[PDB]
Design an enzyme around this catalytic site. Structure first.
Site, PDB file in Angstrom:
ATOM      1  N   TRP B 133       0.850  -1.182   0.000  1.00  0.00           N
ATOM      2  CA  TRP B 133       0.000   0.000   0.000  1.00  0.00           C
ATOM      3  C   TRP B 133       0.889   1.237   0.000  1.00  0.00           C
ATOM      4  O   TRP B 133       1.786   1.344   0.844  1.00  0.00           O
ATOM      5  CB  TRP B 133      -0.880  -0.082   1.244  1.00  0.00           C
ATOM      6  CG  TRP B 133      -1.952   0.895   1.365  1.00  0.00           C
ATOM      7  CD1 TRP B 133      -2.877   1.203   0.431  1.00  0.00           C
ATOM      8  CD2 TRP B 133      -2.259   1.679   2.520  1.00  0.00           C
ATOM      9  NE1 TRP B 133      -3.740   2.150   0.915  1.00  0.00           N
ATOM     10  CE2 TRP B 133      -3.387   2.455   2.201  1.00  0.00           C
ATOM     11  CE3 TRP B 133      -1.692   1.797   3.793  1.00  0.00           C
ATOM     12  CZ2 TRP B 133      -3.959   3.347   3.101  1.00  0.00           C
ATOM     13  CZ3 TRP B 133      -2.262   2.681   4.689  1.00  0.00           C
ATOM     14  CH2 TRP B 133      -3.384   3.449   4.336  1.00  0.00           C
ATOM     15  N   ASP B 214      -0.705  -5.306   9.551  1.00  0.00           N
ATOM     16  CA  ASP B 214      -1.754  -4.438   9.030  1.00  0.00           C
ATOM     17  C   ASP B 214      -2.899  -5.346   8.589  1.00  0.00           C
ATOM     18  O   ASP B 214      -2.758  -6.124   7.641  1.00  0.00           O
ATOM     19  CB  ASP B 214      -1.201  -3.587   7.893  1.00  0.00           C
ATOM     20  CG  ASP B 214      -2.242  -2.687   7.274  1.00  0.00           C
ATOM     21  OD1 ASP B 214      -3.447  -2.858   7.552  1.00  0.00           O
ATOM     22  OD2 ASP B 214      -1.842  -1.810   6.484  1.00  0.00           O
ATOM     23  N   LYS B 249     -13.559  -1.555   5.697  1.00  0.00           N
ATOM     24  CA  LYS B 249     -14.022  -2.363   4.580  1.00  0.00           C
ATOM     25  C   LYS B 249     -14.959  -3.484   5.011  1.00  0.00           C
ATOM     26  O   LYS B 249     -16.003  -3.670   4.377  1.00  0.00           O
ATOM     27  CB  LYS B 249     -12.804  -2.882   3.820  1.00  0.00           C
ATOM     28  CG  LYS B 249     -12.072  -1.748   3.113  1.00  0.00           C
ATOM     29  CD  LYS B 249     -10.624  -1.639   3.551  1.00  0.00           C
ATOM     30  CE  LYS B 249      -9.897  -0.541   2.781  1.00  0.00           C
ATOM     31  NZ  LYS B 249      -8.429  -0.675   2.950  1.00  0.00           N
TER      32      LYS B 249
END
Ligand code: PLP
Ligand code: PLP
Lengths: 399, 399
Positions: B133, B214, B249
């Site tokens: 990311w 993460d 999400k």
């Protein structure tokens, strides 16, 4: 392998928020909380405002997505914020000289400003009033900036020491940041007069300071427009400035984290160029801001019927605090206080320095269950008709 | 006096979040957005989950105050987060080795971890996968930490290059942080097998790395428990680790900024001491976290009826994405692609890592109005039965 966490030292408790922990755990039924700067109504509760409940019901029924906001948040929230700060028809707005990022609280706005300054400019020092909100130093130090103090409060006379302020600020160099509370100085409740604001503005442009306004209490001194007179005097003269504002207190939205960081530069090209780096600093912190609280604020300010309800609710809060200041002073005399406390009436906002020592503040907590900040800052908005007598009896007992 | 903002260099637009601005500006009919990693349903929309609407109604009826949360947020939200990560009955929980702070999104959790590490530990270096990311490097650099890259993706075979990953982490030292994606690697969709996680766990403990997970997509690979297997393999062997997790999400709560930073240390006394410094770092950033989104998550996870609804809505999202992966590959073939895109079926999560060049991504945008990230990352969850055919005709044209 020896642990990465093994040698960490414990942090001291927060002088404000750690008090809240103590107060919660205290088992005495008569305990009184005069610490953190949260409004209470006449019944001792912190309700949701009616304007806010109505806007939340609208959102519940009309929101169709939680898709990410832009990095700078809701556009209408920023437009409404600039109007509140600078007034409808401001030249700053028509000249397109201001940009606003919605932030998580006023604290988040302070940290974003600090990060932005430390990483993109030559700023090294921030000047902060003595005294000030205890978290100012922590925010700026954690962004890598040095914090210096300028004189402000005359404890003998319970007034602004304006000569001392100007003398101490003559040490602030061009390109230093100087931090001003917009109104309702935290913790003293003593604000400059409009004349004094105008002297500081002219001096500021002359010396080359970058003003940074912490505006957490707009509406709690005299009124929305009146409380912005000082900021608007600076905005009339300066090419550059920063405003970190909060809606936590004047909307009672503390835990939804609603604030704004507003950047002003000499022209549209420069502010857009600077704001591009402000957005980069936000992206590397919390990415984009929380929608619920800011959506409430934007709904209220965008709708004349909700805004009129909100303005009345803010006036009610402001006036209830003013009634408690007078009641506090009158009740101390009836309870046997020797000292004169009339200076309390001259202070604006939630807070006042009570003149009490750390030892007296400690006694109030341990012996009477009355919780104040160790500096002697008391929250008048935590006083009610029902707790005024025991609170005042406790203060007289420690004098 | 020269202005402070004159010497500022503009920042480029975010490689992901900037797409929304480019896409909104595009006037061409039929444009397709395959950029930011949000879920879309069969009609191209990002709706609020039913479980979330139900929880929001309960909060509107039952909230009586917006008073500040504690620095670390809603306690129940922390407990539910730990059970979700580590499992009910985890020894980490029973031994009280974990503390969790509610943060503004997963990004806020990463930044809080970064600030905590830079201030309070000897950590100087963070290792992240190539690719990762793009905002990982920005977050850790914002705290002054050096970021190095380790090898991860085999662009020829469209697999994990496990030998190169091992070799490239050879110079990662004891006390360095190594960042792992919990599941649904962003951008590649390639995750370690359980056997590979176990190998990495043992290597991590032998070399003294501080692992940082993460975890932004728990539930989108195979399922909630299954997606946590790799973290739980690490947690069984390690004295210390950090998890940054996001509910953006898997609850569709993107713009309410709902995440958690979880600290794990050797024992209760050590984690509590370290956690006190994490709270100090939060206080100097945004003070305390936003209530609305985390309250929703806590309500849903602590009510068996709502949790069952949510788990089915997450299953439906996962299954739609898998259907679109297969339809995408079939339709590319139908439309005449000679390149074999079957590797896309083996990837996990919202995306496919297609291998298109920067040149081909710019051409899709400018010539067909199809928007992907310049790395060639395409959001499969943005594909629908209605846009699949034109999308595939466009890709075939630039091949
Ligand atoms: C309350 C306050 C803040 C912080 O505002 P939040 O919105 O709660 O982050 C900052 N500065 C001053 C002077 C305050 O009184
Ligand atoms: C989405 C994502 C994040 C950020 O999550 P937010 O909750 O939006 O801050 C962080 N890491 C990865 C890998 C992500 O995919």
């Amino acid at each position: 392998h020896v642990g990465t966490f093994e040698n960490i030292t414990a942090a001291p408790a927060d002088p404000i928020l750690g008090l809240a922990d103590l107060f919660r755990a205290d088992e005495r039924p008569g305990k009184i909380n005069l610490g953190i700067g949260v409004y209470k109504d006449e019944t001792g509760k912190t309700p949701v405002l009616t304007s806010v409940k109505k806007a939340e019901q609208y959102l519940l029924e009309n929101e169709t997505t939680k898709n990410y906001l832009g990095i700078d948040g809701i556009p209408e929230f920023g437009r409404c914020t600039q109007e509140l700060l600078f007034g409808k028809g401001s030249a700053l707005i028509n000249d397109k000289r201001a940009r606003t990022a919605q932030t998580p609280g006023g604290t988040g706005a302070l940290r974003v400003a600090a990060d932005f300054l430390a990483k993109n400019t030559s700023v090294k020092r921030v000047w902060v009033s003595n005294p000030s909100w205890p978290n100012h130093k922590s925010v700026f130090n954690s962004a890598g900036l040095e914090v210096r103090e300028y004189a402000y409060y005359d404890a003998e006379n319970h007034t602004l020491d304006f000569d001392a302020l100007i003398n101490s600020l003559n040490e602030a160099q061009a390109g230093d940041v100087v931090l001003f509370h917009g109104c309702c100085h935290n913790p003293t409740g003593i604000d400059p007069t409009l004349e004094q604001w105008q002297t500081l503005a002219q001096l500021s442009v002359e010396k080359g300071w970058l003003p940074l306004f912490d505006f957490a209490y707009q509406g709690f001194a005299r009124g929305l427009e009146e409380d912005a007179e000082g900021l608007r005097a600076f905005a009339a003269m300066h090419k550059e400035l920063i405003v970190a504002s909060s809606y936590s207190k004047n909307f009672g939205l503390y835990n939804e984290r609603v604030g704004a960081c507003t950047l002003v530069a000499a022209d549209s090209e420069t502010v857009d160029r600077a704001f591009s780096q402000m957005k980069a600093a936000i992206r590397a912190n919390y990415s984009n801001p929380p929608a619920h609280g800011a959506s409430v604020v934007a709904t209220i300010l965008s709708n004349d019927a909700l805004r009129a309800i909100w303005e009345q609710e803010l006036t009610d809060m402001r006036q209830r605090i003013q009634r408690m200041r007078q009641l506090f002073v009158n009740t101390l005399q009836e309870k046997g206080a020797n000292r004169d406390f009339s200076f309390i009436i001259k202070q604006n906002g939630m807070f006042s320095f009570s003149g009490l020592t750390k030892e007296q503040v400690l006694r109030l907590r341990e012996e009477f269950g009355v919780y104040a900040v160790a500096s002697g800052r008391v929250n008048v908005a935590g006083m009610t008709p029902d707790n005024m007598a025991p609170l005042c009896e406790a203060i007289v007992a420690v004098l």
